[PDB]
Amino acid sequence: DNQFYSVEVGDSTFTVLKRYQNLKPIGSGAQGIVCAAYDAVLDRNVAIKKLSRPFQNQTHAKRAYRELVLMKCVNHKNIISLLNVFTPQKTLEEFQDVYLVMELMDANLCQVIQMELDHERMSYLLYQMLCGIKHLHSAGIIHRDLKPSNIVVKSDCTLKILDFGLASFMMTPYVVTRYYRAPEVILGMGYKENVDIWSVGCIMGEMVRHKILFPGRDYIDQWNKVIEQLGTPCPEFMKKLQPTVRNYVENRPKYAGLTFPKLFPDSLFPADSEHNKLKASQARDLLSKMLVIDPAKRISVDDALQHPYINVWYDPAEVEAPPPREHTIEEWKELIYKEVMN
Numbered sequence: 151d152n153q154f155y156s157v158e159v160g161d162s163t164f165t166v167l168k169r170y171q172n173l174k175p176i177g178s179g180a181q182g183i184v185c186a187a188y189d190a191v192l193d194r195n196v197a198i199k200k201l202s203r204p205f206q207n208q209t210h211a212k213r214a215y216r217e218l219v220l221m222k223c224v225n226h227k228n229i230i231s232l233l234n235v236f237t238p239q240k241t242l243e244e245f246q247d248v249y250l251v252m253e254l255m256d257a258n259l260c261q262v263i264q265m266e267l268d269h270e271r272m273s274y275l276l277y278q279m280l281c282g283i284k285h286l287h288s289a290g291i292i293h294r295d296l297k298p299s300n301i302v303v304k305s306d307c308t309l310k311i312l313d314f315g316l317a318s319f320m321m322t323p324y325v326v327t328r329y330y331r332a333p334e335v336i337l338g339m340g341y342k343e344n345v346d347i348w349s350v351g352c353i354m355g356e357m358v359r360h361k362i363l364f365p366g367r368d369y370i371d372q373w374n375k376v377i378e379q380l381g382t383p384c385p386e387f388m389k390k391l392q393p394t395v396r397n398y399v400e401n402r403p404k405y406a407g408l409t410f411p412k413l414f415p416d417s418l419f420p421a422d423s424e425h426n427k428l429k430a431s432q433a434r435d436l437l438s439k440m441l442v443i444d445p446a447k448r449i450s451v452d453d454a455l456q457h458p459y460i461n462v463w464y465d466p467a468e469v470e471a472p473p474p475r476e477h478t479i480e481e482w483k484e485l486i487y488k489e490v491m492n
């Protein structure tokens with residue numbers, strides 16, 4: 151007569167509260183598998199994320215702890231909601247796994263990126279990304295690693311960001327996706343809030359091109375793809391780089407870059423009606439202001455929200471919503487356990 155039961159999901163066991171039924175794996179990330187499930191108590195579908203021994207190293211431990219704390223403070227429609235948290239283990243010494251129960255949506259932004267979207271849906275998704283990032287920024291959280299695999303959407307075009315970013319070493323096969331990180335993250339130069347604007351620009355550009363904008367095996371290839379398309383940065387940008395980094399950037403092959411009309415031609419946009427022709431030119435204008443290498447010249451979150459492509463959605467309830475170190479593995483274990491048990 152225990153509150154829990156176990157089922158096999160791949161080569162992992164999910165041990166969950168009996169209220170959660172008919173689990174089905176929907177995806178996997180760096181922290182492992184997420185299942186969809188029916189919650190018999192709430193009478194709705196939910197997502198269940200299993201953290202296996204998150205205290206096992208600093209990198210897992212710090213993300214798990216941060217995720218728990220921030221999910222409990224933050225309440226915004228464009229940030230994914232935490233519904234419940236549990237461990238099946240009964241004592242700290244027995245403690246192994248943490249299960250996060252989240253609201254469930256319909257699809258990954260990666261799936262939406264593959265679609266041809268009208269301007270109304272495209273702009274509304276972007277508005278919602280900006281709103282969620284704005285709310286984060288107002289709580290002092292700068293995400294720094296926004297990427298489409300970690301944003302989810304519903305059939306009615308509502309959007310939620312799944313994680314809180316952060317930007318080290320783990321011995322797993324999992325490969326971290328870096329295509330969406332800002333120049334200042336890539337070149338390790340320090341950053342402000344509009345570091346996240348670059349990532350939105352990369353996603354928007356990909357929604358249009360249906361190809362990843364700046365792929366690369368690692369930061370070297372990636373920087374190559376940046377300057378080859380946007381062109382070599384100006385001198386005032388060069389001055390803000392650490393000395394070893396500056397020499398490297400100043401010595402790469404030079405490129406003029408492409409115009410934004412060439413980068414995102416009208417053939418990529420809905421452009422049959424006068425409405426869509428105007429929207430395409432507006433979409434291209436915002437792209438030209440987000441995909442800007444020098445953060446001092448890159449558009450801010452607030453100005454982006456005011457941009458004509460975006461501002462048709464503006465709602466102060468949504469935009470100006472009220473805002474909310476290191477240890478050993480044993481220390482992290484108790485921190486996380488304490489958080490879990492409230």
Ligand SMILES: CCC(=O)c1c(-c2ccccc2)c2cc(Cl)ccc2c(=O)n1Cc1ccc(C(=O)O)cc1
Pocket residue numbers: 176177178179183184186197198199230252253254255256257258259299300302303312
């Ligand atoms: C590819 C999975 C995916 O996009 C996803 C993930 C996800 C994101 C990255 C890694 C792991 C999980 C997710 C994770 C948490 Cl914590 C909460 C909600 C979701 C979610 O709503 N979806 C959409 C979704 C929901 C059901 C199905 C389905 O029924 O097939 C497909 C997509």
